[PDB]
Amino acid sequence: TTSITDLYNEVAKSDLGLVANPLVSIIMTSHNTAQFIEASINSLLLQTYKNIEIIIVDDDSSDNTFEIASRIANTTSKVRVFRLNSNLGTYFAKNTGILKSKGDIIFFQDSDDVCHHERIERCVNILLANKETIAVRCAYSRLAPETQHIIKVNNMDYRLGFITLGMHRKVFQEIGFFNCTTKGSDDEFFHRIAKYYGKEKIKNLLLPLYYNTMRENSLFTDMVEWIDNHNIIQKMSDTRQHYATLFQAMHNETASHDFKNLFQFPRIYDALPVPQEMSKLSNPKIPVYINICSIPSRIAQLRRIIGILKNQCDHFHIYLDGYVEIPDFIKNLGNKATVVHCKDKDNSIRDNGKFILLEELIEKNQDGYYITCDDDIIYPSDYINTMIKKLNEYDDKAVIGLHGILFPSRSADRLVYSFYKPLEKDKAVNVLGTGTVSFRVSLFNQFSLSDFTHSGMADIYFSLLCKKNNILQICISRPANWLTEDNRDSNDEQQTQLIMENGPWGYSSIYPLVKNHPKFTDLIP
């Protein structure tokens, strides 16, 4: 046998779903699919339903998948592209695309697949037929990419799937987001909707409108058993069935108002206990402390940053410099924030407030991942997972950052790796911009904030701390505009003084630390 042409004929034979046009968002995830992704995108641009946007989230592809999607996204306003800077799984990438999407209806399409040119039209009409309907799905077929023949799944040409789901945007803010596993969470989220809304509000359009490419070592190969060249058996694996039993029980036992909070996004800890095979989340085995200073001139920026990072950490330390009162959204955090209000500009140490909590944590011998942020930077949804995972790459023995400065060894002769600019490979540097750094507290045995004498140059004093402790500063790899600026219309005598007094710099300062450790060996070229 059977072919894709036979499916196309059956669809034209049917009128199901052919009788105000809201924006439809299609969320595409991609991971090393450069051979397939342009076919996936073109099958959406050729959709009958014309009021669409295609949201593409690349999950840190090592091939040129994102280069292709970036090329296409600049040809049209219907395509927008984003890149996670670490491999976190398709469901983390879907949730990132949802937050970027703008449509009232949300569909999905994996990058290794294509679909029928009438899929969104027919499914949208079925969805909106009955105003009490919450979501719609259609059927899919597995295909051999060479021959365009149907691979039968349990001896059927087509069957209902989960990638074919379409739903109103309100689902995600009422019951939360996809669980950030590697596989299975579409089965979970489907049955999460059915619990909350009632399965009768899930309409099924039983037509073969989605065409799944069959490729080896993909995510669903976990469940495959080959019979012949035209049939396979789909049967859950052990690790998949542990998860199915798990969320079924969870669906019964979890108060339905809590789904919204159990499955928030972004996140850094597993929502459900799963083996490491099922999760790519950082899962820090120590607490995560986010430290930020802010001024009232940038309250619109600070509101954004607290919303994104609120679930990306265990605790905040907020230093308000000149606020009239604590904004609503900061004290809403409650105990998650240790706020420090400073109303007199004369009693202010300014950006040195990023390191107030560092003294207390060392004095109490409490460990954690210490992150410092500014209030003019837009942090992506994968920020804290990426930083902890890069820190773990060097076994927590180093400090990582994004705004890196490298000096001559004997401005204008500094090389500046700006945080919003790209960097292809990790590169050791001399100074990291403290709006973007991260490190483990147990690198440091002693610390006193009194050492940070003058304000306005916290970046420099922190390098001197790292140098005097034999600690290396790593500028990690990143796509362009992973972080971005939101200055929005918002010498150096002491600067040059502190540098020369504490020489040497350049690669002479870095090479002693790269010297005999093989994980650092490629940081210095």
Ligand SMILES: O=c1ccn([C@@H]2O[C@H](COP(=O)(O)OP(=O)(O)O)[C@@H](O)[C@H]2O)c(=O)[nH]1
């Ligand atoms: O770490 C990963 C693994 C997979 N995928 C994407 O998830 C989608 C579905 O994965 P796969 O094709 O492996 O699923 P299957 O075809 O086995 O059902 C594809 O677009 C992959 O690029 C992803 O974004 N990140």
Ligand SMILES: O=c1ccn([C@@H]2O[C@H](COP(=O)(O)OP(=O)(O)O)[C@@H](O)[C@H]2O)c(=O)[nH]1
């Ligand atoms: O009086 C001030 C001015 C600035 N900052 C903080 O200093 C950091 C960086 O400020 P800015 O973006 O001006 O620094 P630059 O990027 O120019 O180094 C942010 O946390 C600001 O809220 C502060 O606490 N008090």
Ligand SMILES: [Cl-]
């Ligand atoms: Cl990006």
Ligand SMILES: [Cl-]
């Ligand atoms: Cl899956």
Ligand SMILES: [Cl-]
């Ligand atoms: Cl948390």
Ligand SMILES: [Mn+2]
């Ligand atoms: Mn696939």
Ligand SMILES: [Mn+2]
């Ligand atoms: Mn700044």
Ligand code: NA
């Ligand atoms: Na675009």
